[PDB]
Amino acid sequence: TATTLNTPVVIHATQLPQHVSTDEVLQFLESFIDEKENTNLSSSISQLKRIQRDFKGLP
Amino acid sequence: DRLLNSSDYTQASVCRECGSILTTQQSVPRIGSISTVCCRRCSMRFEDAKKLLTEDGEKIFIDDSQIWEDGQGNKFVGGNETTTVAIPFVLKYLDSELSAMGIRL
Amino acid sequence: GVHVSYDNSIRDADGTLVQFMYGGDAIDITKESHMTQFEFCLDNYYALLKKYNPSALIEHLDVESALKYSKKTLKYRKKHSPHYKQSVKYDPVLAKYNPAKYLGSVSENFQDKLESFLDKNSKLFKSSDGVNEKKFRALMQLKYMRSLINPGEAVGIIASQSVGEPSTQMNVTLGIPRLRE
Amino acid sequence: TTCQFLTKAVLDNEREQLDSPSARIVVGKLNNVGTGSFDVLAKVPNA
Amino acid sequence: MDISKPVGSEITSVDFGILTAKEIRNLSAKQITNPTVLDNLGHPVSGGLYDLALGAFLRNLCSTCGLDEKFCPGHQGHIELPVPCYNPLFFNQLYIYLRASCLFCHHFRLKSVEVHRYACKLRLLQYGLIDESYKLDEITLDISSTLLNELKSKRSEYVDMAIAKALSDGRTTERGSFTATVNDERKKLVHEFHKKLLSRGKCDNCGMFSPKFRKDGFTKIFETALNEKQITNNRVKGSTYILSTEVKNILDTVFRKEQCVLQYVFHSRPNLSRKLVKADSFFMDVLVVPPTRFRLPSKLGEEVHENSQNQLLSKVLTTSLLIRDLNDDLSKLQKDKVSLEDRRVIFSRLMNAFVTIQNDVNAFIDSTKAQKVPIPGVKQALEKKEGLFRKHMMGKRVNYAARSVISPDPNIETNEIGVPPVFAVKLTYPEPVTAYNIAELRQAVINGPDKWPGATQIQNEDGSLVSLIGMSVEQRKALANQLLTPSSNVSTHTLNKKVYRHIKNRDVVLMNRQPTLHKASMMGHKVRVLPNEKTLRLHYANTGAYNADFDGDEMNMHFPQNENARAEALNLANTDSQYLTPTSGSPVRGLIQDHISAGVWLTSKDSF
Amino acid sequence: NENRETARFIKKHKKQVTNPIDEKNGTSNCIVRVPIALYVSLAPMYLENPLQGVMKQHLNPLVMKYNNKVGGVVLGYEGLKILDADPLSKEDTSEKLIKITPDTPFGFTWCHVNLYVWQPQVGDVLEGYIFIQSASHIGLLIHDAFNASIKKNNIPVDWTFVHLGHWVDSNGEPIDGKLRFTVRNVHTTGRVVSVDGTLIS
Amino acid sequence: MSTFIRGPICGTDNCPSRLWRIIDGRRTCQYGHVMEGDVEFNDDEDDLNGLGAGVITRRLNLTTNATGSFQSSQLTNSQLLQQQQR
Amino acid sequence: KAIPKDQRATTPYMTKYERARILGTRALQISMNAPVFVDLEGETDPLRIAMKELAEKKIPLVIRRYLPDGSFEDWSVEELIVD
Amino acid sequence: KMQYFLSTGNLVSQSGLDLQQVSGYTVVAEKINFYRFISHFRMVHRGSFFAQLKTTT
Amino acid sequence: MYKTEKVDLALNRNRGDPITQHFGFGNDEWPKEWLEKLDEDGLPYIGTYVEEGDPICAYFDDTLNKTKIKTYHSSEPAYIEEVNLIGDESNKFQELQTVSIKYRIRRTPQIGDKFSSRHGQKGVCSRKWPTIDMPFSETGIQPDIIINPHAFPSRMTIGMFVESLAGKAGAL
RNA sequence: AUGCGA
Ligand SMILES: [Zn+2]
Ligand SMILES: [Zn+2]
Ligand SMILES: [Zn+2]
């Protein structure tokens, strides 16, 4: 991903970020990973799942 | 298609913050650092950097002269004919300039 | 830089307006040749009706607004049929309705010649099998709409070539010295 | 008199709005005449 | 061009404007100080015109990007001019503004309130409010400073009303208002303005008698003596050559003290940038250094001739070194210089050397401003008769094009062009491969570059190019069975391979014949490959549109490389759409000579 | 005037937030959700899945990856919205419109999406499970995602070696499992992000 | 032996061979694939009025465009020539 | 700049310039694996494919007619009278 | 020097030899055809300077 | 059509010095297929067919320790008609540094090649008509050249008509 | 630039 066909030309935020709670973070993790599970990005999702476990309690 | 696409069509760097396509350069990489596009005009010499009144960490990029820079990371690529680059040579010698506009600068 | 805006006005690529219509009729030269050859169109009427069949398009436009202005303008024109005593109450029909949208918005010169043809040929309309000056007039209006200059035409350049190219074949100064002067 | 018009332009700090077809060619831009008189977009399904 | 590499940062306009020495120093990749060009009799001199920081050279990586001559875009250096040079291009300007000032007060010799009136008019013409610009003259009422300042108040109030209204009315915008007529009224105004500025033959703000200013023509200004009546009149109100430096400090002070008017004087549109109008714009305190890329030597066959810019610029470096030598006299002289009056020759070095450096900088800009056939400068490169703009911008050479003598042929269509197999094998279309064209393109690849409907090259979606020019039937056969492989990298998954196929019977080509006197002389034809031809084959029906004749006429055949160019050349420029000319609407395409006599004989009632 | 340039340095180099320690017992909320607007290309082959097109093209490579612009490794995205090129809807429609470049079949569009970013800062005190122990560093892994290492020089000499041997803490027992550290630096310039930790503050 | 590379190698496939297609203007892989450079320079048109005193002239100390990727050479001291003639 | 559709005042017909550009761009997209909405019916030239799509209005494109003011009218192929 | 002048046709001297031009005096015999060869020696030129004139008188 | 080429070794100025390149070889590693064109003295065999790319001479420069060749670059083949060795004007020149090679390029009448009568009525050959397809006279002949009549009404080259009838009489 | 094909 090195050119327009892969990388965004421009990115701007429109407000100052919002500090997602642990509960909001975990709910996002489960919803995002669950929606994604349904291609090397899957492997990064596996790391996200470990993050889920780390934000779930236990490695 | 003819007078460009089939002749000197070049995707050239332009600084979205300085409106020129000739200050752009490839910044020097390192064993842990890739080549990054930097705009010379949109960067400060690391010897100054308000250092007297003042870092993010990753906005200094280095020249083949091993010179540290701050900024210059706002340049992009746009399609133009290369002779255009030829103009800054003479016109830019003439002490004039192109403010090559783009998008949201 | 000189081209046709989408509003039929000739603007330069700057935006400066040059003419409110192309030659004042919005007619393409590459169309005009028969746009005033009515009798020819008539003897080949059914073919042109097969080309320009209006029933496909009669749903996309208005066939009256321009025709109605044609009615008021026909009134002032029959009343005022001296030049400085102009139709100041009635601009030409091309001024009031986009000629590509309301069939009948046509130069008064073209309208006049067309009607004069219909009057001087009423006897061919008394020699035909199935044709009338209302359906024939409808056809000629539709041909006129279909001869209009397209939005975006490079008419500036076209003009320049139409003066240059034939000037290569070329009491007072004539020819190139006159044109250069 | 390219340089003379150049001088009068720079002294004005002029900005080219890059409408002239020649100028538009200079920057390698779709010519504004004819087929470049308009833009084309696409209707795409959102779901 | 590649359809596979879009960009979405197109330029929307181009601003013009003067550089700044601090800008140059900050962007400058290097200062070039050494008038040397090569070193070790054969090496790029450190800190000279060919320093490697200015790009790549002869295997040496660009010392600023470490990139080869095939990659480093090059970087522009700069020269620190010992003294501020006059900018030739604006030299007439700085001259005018010099003659317009007052030398005892350093103000413009026009009434301050009248000047402010001029600034008002030019401000209203940034917004193009012409009616108000003319309506401004009417505001009218020993004259008190309170009253002339009252005119300035009322006039500024008029600016506030006409602007506030016009922005309220949307009859302009923050970005100004610009049309051909506004530009015209501006140039007219600025001209009469220049006439008023020149008209004052004595000061008004200060009443002082300024000296007459004379100039050499392109390197010196002189200051004429005054009359004892005017000199003693100036005291009761209480030609010499001058250097550029003094001019700079004077025009600096005048241009700063008169910034308020000049802010609108130097812009035809609102200066949103709050840019100071500085006198250093007309002078060159420094000189840039072009990219090495554009300074490459003239090698003709084997012999490589030095770049003419390098020559003139080296002349700048030598002359500058001489000025460094006079500065050697100042550091040298130093010790008071009481009566060592000989400095009269070193004074010849400063005056002569200094006018010399200016003359040489001018010469580097414009050959016709220096003092047989002196290498042309950038002005000559850009114009001279037609110029760089005309010879390499308004028209260029183009790739995918051919030229050959045209030969008639009645058996082809009137919309086709017979392409000789010499051209049929060397003109390609970059065909993206699909599910519907896989068979045809696999076959074309199988044929290879040296046969009919084949393809010379394959461009991967990864960006790589694969030439088939020299691949064996085995290797091309193998690649034909690999043309449809799947994606490999998420960076490239959206693309499909490309095949550079030979031109074939489904391609349209844009034929052009010499004096394009009119658009009808350059039409799109459907390509028809003719075997055993060597010349571009053409139907007679076109010869009255090209004004062509087989006596020996040559035609350019252009092969467009893009589906937009195909669709336009098949739909707009195509020959059939060119059956009538716009000049008259007379048909330009019909049978000719022999076909006419055949029609006369065949169509006789006597022919059965 | 000489203060425009210092306003340019401070106003250009301003920092948005200082993620604090959650409850002052957790970790700094360096994880934040920020809605952004990106401008991405759309190929024609995704012309029938435009939200999925934009996803597979630009957003999928962004997860588990550092963004200089956001200042961190994208933790995830929320609420993608393609900005319609043409006014009037009921903030919604069965088809959108998008600009095609004036040269090629590729599309370009505005996009609005919420990003979940891990935005760590220097000084945050964090705990990690010891990855490695070499005589110049201790490797740890934050949340099982971010690699962190504290080099010997940044570790207090009061720490104790036990022979890649086994470091023993300043208290007099060897370290094990999780370690609490302050963030000195985060090294992202390379193929993988590295978090610079300290044991001396 | 000597090595290959004193200019370019195909970083794609590990094939260190190079082709010249003078008709293409292309430097390409002798065995494998792709474009080794799109850029191609110096084969001027019909416009060399020769005002250029072109004082430069090659002398083998500024190298050469290397237009031969074919190489072997050796380390040199600097113009054998005198040692050759000796 | 958006001239409302209810207010569109321009030519119901596609200019030859419009037809040309639409056919070029749409052909190019189909040639880049845009989903074909019509029977390929054997064809191999993407341009004639785009012509088939134009004849059926399957083209999913809209014309942005510019006015020198900057106002524009967004027109579908499926409405602008093809010929 | 005379090979010089004969190889370029730029005859230059401090008198200008009373000639309106300083080039074009010499031509390559161009033996591509016997007709061409004999024709050079029967060619007579009004001189380049009149080639520069705009009129045709 | 004959093209003459000068292969010069005037590589080094200074009016002589070193001069070291000699037509021939040294490393043997050269492609022995070069013998297919150049004699073991480095010059092509007079008479040799050459096609684009073939070496026109071979020599050796001690500076490069390599056997180099000057290639012929054209779109069409020729034949080497004569190769002339130039030692002339030289004082010593023992190295044989100047060689002149003359190429013979045959030019067959071809579609597009120009032809003209003595009447300034010039025309390109549009095609090489098969003899069977030519028109044949009752004398049993088919013409050499066919010129379109439609040319005469504008040009009024009636002298060419007279030359036709005079050449016909004069042959009979 | 000089001569020349178109
Ligand atoms: Zn910049
Ligand atoms: Zn560099
Ligand atoms: Zn004064």
Numbering used by the authors:
A (entry chain D): 12 to 49, 80 to 100
B (entry chain B): 1090 to 1143, 1146 to 1196
C (entry chain A): 1029 to 1109, 1112 to 1200, 1214 to 1224
D (entry chain A): 1617 to 1663
E (entry chain A): 1 to 141, 172 to 268, 312 to 444, 450 to 686
F (entry chain G): 8 to 170, 214 to 251
G (entry chain P): 1 to 86
H (entry chain F): 72 to 154
Give me lines lifted from the publication on this model:
The large ribosomal RNA precursor (pre-rRNA) is transcribed by Pol I, accounting for up to 60% of total cellular RNA synthesis in Saccharomyces cerevisiae. Yeast Pol I transcription initiation is regulated by four general transcription factors: the regulatory factor Rrn3, the Core Factor, the TATA-box Binding Protein (TBP), and the Upstream Activation Factor (UAF). In addition to recruiting Pol I/Rrn3 to the ribosomal DNA (rDNA) promoter, Core Factor has also been implicated in transcription bubble opening. To gain insight into Core Factor’s role during Pol I transcription initiation, we obtained a Pol I Initial Transcribing Complex (ITC) and determined its structure to near-atomic resolution using cryo-EM.
We thereby subsequently obtained reconstructions of the Pol I Initial Transcribing Complex in three distinct functional states, with overall resolutions of 4.2 Å, 4.3 Å and 3.9 Å for states we respectively designate State 1, 2, and 3. Compared to State1, the Core Factor/DNA complex is rotated ~10° toward the front of Pol I in State 2, allowing the upstream promoter to insert into the active site cleft, whereas the Core Factor/DNA complex resides at an intermediate location in State 3. In State 2, the movement of Core Factor/DNA correlates well with the stabilization of Rrn7 zinc ribbon/linker on Pol I. This likely positions the Rrn7 linker region close to the single-stranded template DNA in the cleft, suggesting that the Rrn7 zinc ribbon/linker region might play a role similar to that of TFIIB during Pol II transcription initiation. In addition, the recombinant ΔZR Core Factor also failed to recover the defect in open complex formation in the ΔZR extract, whereas the wild type (WT) complex did. This data, together with the finding that Core Factor complex bearing the ΔZR Rrn7 can still be recruited to rDNA promoter, indicates that the Rrn7 N-terminal region promotes transcription bubble opening, consistent with the State 2 structure. In our reconstruction of State 2, we observed the Rrn7 zinc ribbon domain residing in the RNA exit channel, similar to that of TFIIB, consistent with its functional conservation based on similarity at the level of domain architecture. Comparison of State 2 with State 3 reveals another striking feature in that there are clear clashes between the Rrn7 linker region and the A49 tandem winged helix domain. Third, State 2 is an intermediate between State 1 and 3 in terms of clamp closing and tandem winged helix domain stabilization. Additionally, we observed stabilized zinc ribbon and linker regions of Rrn7, in a conformation similar to that of TFIIB. Thus, State 2 may represent the state of bubble opening, following promoter DNA insertion while preceding initial RNA synthesis.
